[PDB]
Amino acid sequence: LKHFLNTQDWSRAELDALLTQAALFKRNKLGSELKGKSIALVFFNPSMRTRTSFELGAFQLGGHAVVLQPGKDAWPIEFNLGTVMDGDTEEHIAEVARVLGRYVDLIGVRAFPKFVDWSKDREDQVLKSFAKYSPVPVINMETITHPCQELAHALALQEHFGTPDLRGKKYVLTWTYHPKPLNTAVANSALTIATRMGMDVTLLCPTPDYILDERYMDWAAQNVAESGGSLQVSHDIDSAYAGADVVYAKSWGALPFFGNWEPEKPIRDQYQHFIVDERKMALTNNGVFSHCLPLRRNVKATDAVMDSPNCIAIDEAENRLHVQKAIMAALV
Amino acid sequence: LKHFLNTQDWSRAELDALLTQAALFKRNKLGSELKGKSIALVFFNPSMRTRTSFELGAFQLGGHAVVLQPGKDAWPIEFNLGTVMDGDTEEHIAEVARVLGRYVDLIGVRAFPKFVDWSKDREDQVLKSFAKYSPVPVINMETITHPCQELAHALALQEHFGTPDLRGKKYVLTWTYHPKPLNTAVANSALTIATRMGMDVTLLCPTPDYILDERYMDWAAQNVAESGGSLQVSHDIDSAYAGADVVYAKSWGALPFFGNWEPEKPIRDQYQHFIVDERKMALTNNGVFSHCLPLRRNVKATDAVMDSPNCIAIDEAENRLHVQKAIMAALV
Amino acid sequence: LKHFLNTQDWSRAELDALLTQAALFKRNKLGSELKGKSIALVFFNPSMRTRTSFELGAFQLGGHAVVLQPGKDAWPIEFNLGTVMDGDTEEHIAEVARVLGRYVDLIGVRAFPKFVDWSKDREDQVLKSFAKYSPVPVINMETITHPCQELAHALALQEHFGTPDLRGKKYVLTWTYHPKPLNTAVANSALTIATRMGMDVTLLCPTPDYILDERYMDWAAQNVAESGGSLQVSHDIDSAYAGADVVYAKSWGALPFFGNWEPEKPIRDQYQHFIVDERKMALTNNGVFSHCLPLRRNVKATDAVMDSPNCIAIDEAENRLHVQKAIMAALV
Numbered sequence: 004l005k006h007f008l009n010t011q012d013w014s015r016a017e018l019d020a021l022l023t024q025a026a027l028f029k030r031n032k033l034g035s036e037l038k039g040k041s042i043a044l045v046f047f048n049p050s051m052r053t054r055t056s057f058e059l060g061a062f063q064l065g066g067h068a069v070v071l072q073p074g075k076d077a078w079p080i081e082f083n084l085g086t087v088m089d090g091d092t093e094e095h096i097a098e099v100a101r102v103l104g105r106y107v108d109l110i111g112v113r114a115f116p117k118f119v120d121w122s123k124d125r126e127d128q129v130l131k132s133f134a135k136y137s138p139v140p141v142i143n144m145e146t147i148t149h150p151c152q153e154l155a156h157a158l159a160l161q162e163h164f165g166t167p168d169l170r171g172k173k174y175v176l177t178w179t180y181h182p183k184p185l186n187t188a189v190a191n192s193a194l195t196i197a198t199r200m201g202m203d204v205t206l207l208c209p210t211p212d213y214i215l216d217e218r219y220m221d222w223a224a225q226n227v228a229e230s231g232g233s234l235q236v237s238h239d240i241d242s243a244y245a246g247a248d249v250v251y252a253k254s255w256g257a258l259p260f261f262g263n264w265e266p267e268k269p270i271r272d273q274y275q276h277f278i279v280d281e282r283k284m285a286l287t288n289n290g291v292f293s294h295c296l297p298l299r300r301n302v303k304a305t306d307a308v309m310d311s312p313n314c315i316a317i318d319e320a321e322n323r324l325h326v327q328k329a330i331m332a333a334l335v
Numbered sequence: 336l337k338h339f340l341n342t343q344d345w346s347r348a349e350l351d352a353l354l355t356q357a358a359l360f361k362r363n364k365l366g367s368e369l370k371g372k373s374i375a376l377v378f379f380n381p382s383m384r385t386r387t388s389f390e391l392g393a394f395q396l397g398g399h400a401v402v403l404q405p406g407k408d409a410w411p412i413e414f415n416l417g418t419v420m421d422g423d424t425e426e427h428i429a430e431v432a433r434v435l436g437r438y439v440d441l442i443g444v445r446a447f448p449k450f451v452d453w454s455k456d457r458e459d460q461v462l463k464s465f466a467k468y469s470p471v472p473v474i475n476m477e478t479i480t481h482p483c484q485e486l487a488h489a490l491a492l493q494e495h496f497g498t499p500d501l502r503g504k505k506y507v508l509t510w511t512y513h514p515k516p517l518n519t520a521v522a523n524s525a526l527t528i529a530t531r532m533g534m535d536v537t538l539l540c541p542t543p544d545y546i547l548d549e550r551y552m553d554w555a556a557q558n559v560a561e562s563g564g565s566l567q568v569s570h571d572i573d574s575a576y577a578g579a580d581v582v583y584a585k586s587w588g589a590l591p592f593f594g595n596w597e598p599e600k601p602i603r604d605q606y607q608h609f610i611v612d613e614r615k616m617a618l619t620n621n622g623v624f625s626h627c628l629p630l631r632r633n634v635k636a637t638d639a640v641m642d643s644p645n646c647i648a649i650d651e652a653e654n655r656l657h658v659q660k661a662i663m664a665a666l667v
Numbered sequence: 668l669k670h671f672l673n674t675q676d677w678s679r680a681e682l683d684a685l686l687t688q689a690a691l692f693k694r695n696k697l698g699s700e701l702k703g704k705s706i707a708l709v710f711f712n713p714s715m716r717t718r719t720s721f722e723l724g725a726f727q728l729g730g731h732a733v734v735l736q737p738g739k740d741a742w743p744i745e746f747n748l749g750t751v752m753d754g755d756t757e758e759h760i761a762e763v764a765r766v767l768g769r770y771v772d773l774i775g776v777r778a779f780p781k782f783v784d785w786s787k788d789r790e791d792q793v794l795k796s797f798a799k800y801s802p803v804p805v806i807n808m809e810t811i812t813h814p815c816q817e818l819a820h821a822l823a824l825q826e827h828f829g830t831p832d833l834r835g836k837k838y839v840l841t842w843t844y845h846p847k848p849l850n851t852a853v854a855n856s857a858l859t860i861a862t863r864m865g866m867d868v869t870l871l872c873p874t875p876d877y878i879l880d881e882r883y884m885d886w887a888a889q890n891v892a893e894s895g896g897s898l899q900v901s902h903d904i905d906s907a908y909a910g911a912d913v914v915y916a917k918s919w920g921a922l923p924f925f926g927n928w929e930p931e932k933p934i935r936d937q938y939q940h941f942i943v944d945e946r947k948m949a950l951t952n953n954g955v956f957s958h959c960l961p962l963r964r965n966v967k968a969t970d971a972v973m974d975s976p977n978c979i980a981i982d983e984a985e986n987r988l989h990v991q992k993a994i995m996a997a998l999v
């Protein structure tokens with residue numbers, strides 16, 4: 004059974020095929036690839052673009068999406084095995100996934116980490132459990148990686164540069180400020196796809212404490228050694244931005260401070276200058292800027308940067324619809 | 336770009352065309368005016384009729400509605416310009432409207448005032464922001480006016496009297512009781528459409544403090560001088576109801592007490608007799624009664640009045656579906 | 668006007684026809700029985716299977732389901748007659764049902780008892796009110812009985828035994844543990860359909876305090892005297908399970924302790940051994956086990972029992988989709 008849990012699990016040929024079908028769907032939006040079929044969109048956290056794009060995608064391909072929110076409308080779910088369910092959870096994922104599998108043709112799941120202990124969050128328990136127990140394909144709508152965002156992002160880049168081959172371009176994945184510590188998911192994904200596409204990647208972040216999990220630093224290393232690109236970690240703003248072709252910002256809490264954010268607060272607060280403004284973007288080679296959204300203006304990026312003709316965030320956002328339809332079509 | 340923010344922005348010819356198409360859709364409900372198209376229904380407050388009627392309307396015309404609730408499922412939105420987003424809001428309407436505009440063909444928005452300061456609520460910031468930043472038509476699903484309700488109401492009246500020409504009829508817009516101070520939106524809208532239709536309008540309310548915002552009193556004045564009707568403010572029940580052809584009730588907090596409801600509580604509480612009962616309706620010329628709903632029985636109107644054959648509230652409620660389909664068809 | 672409030676209200680011929688159409692829909696899922704039609708699914712409590720199955724069912728038959736949650740998105744509703752609505756409820760069911768009746772073709776309603784006073788919960792006020800005021804057919808999505816579950820369950824049994832005639836088989840409806848007192852709805856329904864199908868039924872429960880409401884014990888008595896089966900109440904585990912062909916578990920709070928659960932807590936807590944495990948199921952005649960779900964593993968039933976090839980709960984869950992489509996088709 005083929006799932007869409009991570010682009011890393013797919014071959015470059017399969018990913019290229021997805022992106023191409025995405026471009027094709029962008030040209031002809033209505034189709035019958037999902038006629039009479041349905042997808043259950045399970046959300047354990049908030050969403051605007053993901054819920055909307057998947058729901059419309061199913062509709063445009065002749066299918067139907069059922070939106071579920073455990074703890075809100077659906078019953079809370081237990082994932083640990085062999086435990087006595089006398090707590091807050093009403094049913095086990097074993098039953099949930101099997102039941103849904105009798106109703107729908109695809110299952111999407113969004114579940115952010117709990118931020119109490121990275122040792123447990125990094126195991127990707129919710130996603131793996133759905134994939135384990137579901138008799139139908141499972142799609143990652145963001146857990147500790149955000150693969151649908153990776154493809155929307157990659158397509159937007161290929162569209163901007165007018166070619167599927169991004170090798171050569173200097174890609175800068177920069178950390179940015181936010182009053183709260185966030186998920187590293189989008190950053191892990193950006194690092195993964197940027198290297199898989201063979202670009203010259205630079206992970207710009209405040210201090211070594213903000214370096215991503217080894218799992219992704221290693222995926223990136225293997226991707227580079229096979230794509231022809233390169234990976235580099237930096238803590239100097241100006242040097243990183245210089246000559247860049249692409250700048251992708253994202254904020255995230257330092258992994259070493261999981262379950263202990265009290266001391267990390269003052270640390271991030273002294274790096275508010277990592278905000279993407281005109282000054283930094285001027286150091287790039289007429290490079291493009293993007294963010295996965297939602298974005299806090301004048302915090303993560305300035306109004307000027309967001310309204311700049313070089314900001315392709317809205318195009319990347321649109322592409323979420325096209326890439327997802329390609330993913331659903333490929334899995335059914 | 337044409338939007339449906341207020342009937343006042345539309346010409347009488349355009350409004351007559353909408354009402355006619357509404358009547359046509361009421362005769363033939365299934366159509367293809369929205370085939371493959373979609374509308375994002377953004378709700379910042381509760382709704383039963385609006386969400387249901389729009390959702391079914393999109394379905395019946397071959398399209399699909401995506402229901403969103405910022406703060407509930409979708410991310411909270413910021414509307415103020417050039418501010419530092421380090422508060423409760425995650426993204427700016429600038430991005431929200433542009434992203435949705437890449438997904439859907441129409442955007443509906445419902446956003447009640449905050450009731451903290453009428454000076455800010457009356458600016459209609461949420462609605463204006465969507466219309467400003469959206470690349471697709473925007474529809475007012477109720478903010479400080481309720482135009483979809485105006486047309487459902489007008490159509491119901493034309494159906495009751497068997498003619499589109501309502502000139503001559505005596506229309507009474509009466510305030511009614513409610514334990515809490517409410518939005519003036521429906522009252523502002525009733526005053527607007529009743530005069531636009533050229534009826535003899537009387538705004539019956541407890542005291543001068545309950546008179547509506549000058550903006551709408553002025554719209555009404557201009558509507559009368561062009562429709563042939565008339566406007567009048569009254570504080571005497573019996574005289575107002577006498578010979579009336581239509582009685583539309585609605586409760587609302589006195590504008591002069593915005594952000595300071597403590598002292599207004601005892602004021603409204605001494606006017607519970609403004610409730611629409613058999614006695615008052617008997618003073619009318621076999622007139623009809625209606626309310627936008629939801630209605631608190633034995634508080635706003637008595638059970639007898641609600642179950643009276645002269646109460647057309649259910650018909651007006653149904654018309655919300657037909658008028659809205661006419662609006663969506665006209666905007667696409 | 669025909670509604671689907673309880674299987675008891677339907678003749679055996681009509682129920683047999685529903686089950687047959689259910690089997691037919693299971694063979695050919697896409698149809699046009701609800702083309703252009705819609706159903707309003709009103710939920711006053713949580714749901715995963717019910718919301719999903721009804722929503723997909725409407726879609727597969729060419730219709731559309733509108734999901735509503737009073738108090739969450741829709742306005743709170745009042746059901747008592749002739750009262751002054753100055754409390755938490757915004758509108759009366761009289762208006763709600765009539766308005767929905769102008770929009771949709773069917774109305775489903777789920778409303779659990781309040782658990783404050785069985786004397787009032789047993790009156791089934793919400794369901795009866797919808798059926799009273801709605802101009803369109805009403806469907807019970809679970810209140811104090813769960814008829815859609817009854818048919819999904821019955822069909823699963825007929826499929827397992829390879830015949831619609833279940834007479835002769837020994838059916839055991841056993842109470843099970845749960846940290847909290849639950850609704851008796853599913854148990855009342857199981858007792859009702861098991862006897863209506865003419866099986867040898869045994870209601871196994873801890874003490875006489877856990878016996879179901881007389882209303883259902885009486886329905887069962889009348890069903891037996893007409894179906895040829897038999898009814899029996901038991902408090903001895905091993906004797907009940909011995910030679911059973913079917914074992915259906917469900918937990919519920921003792922009716923005599925409604926509104927006074929404090930003292931019942933220690934009572935249920937001393938019967939945790941009523942859990943359905945391998946030991947008990949081994950006493951059966953290679954019998955099948957099922958539960959309506961959601962189920963707490965290692966509390967209501969053990970992991971071994973749930974993963975046993977004799978557990979048909981997933982099949983019963985799937986059947987909810989098929990039986991419901993048969994119900995909607997029959998009512999339109």
Ligand SMILES: CCC[C@H](NC(C)=O)C(=O)O
Pocket residue numbers: 145185186187188189295296297425
């Ligand atoms: C697109 C994912 C956004 C989510 N953002 C927040 C602010 O929680 C995150 O950081 O993963």
Ligand SMILES: CCC[C@H](NC(C)=O)C(=O)O
Pocket residue numbers: 477517518519520521627628629757
């Ligand atoms: C149809 C709009 C109803 C809303 N009512 C309440 C009670 O908030 C209002 O007064 O504007």
Ligand SMILES: CCC[C@H](NC(C)=O)C(=O)O
Pocket residue numbers: 093809849850851852853959960961
């Ligand atoms: C299928 C109905 C399940 C509901 N369960 C809970 C746990 O509330 C009940 O006991 O009625």
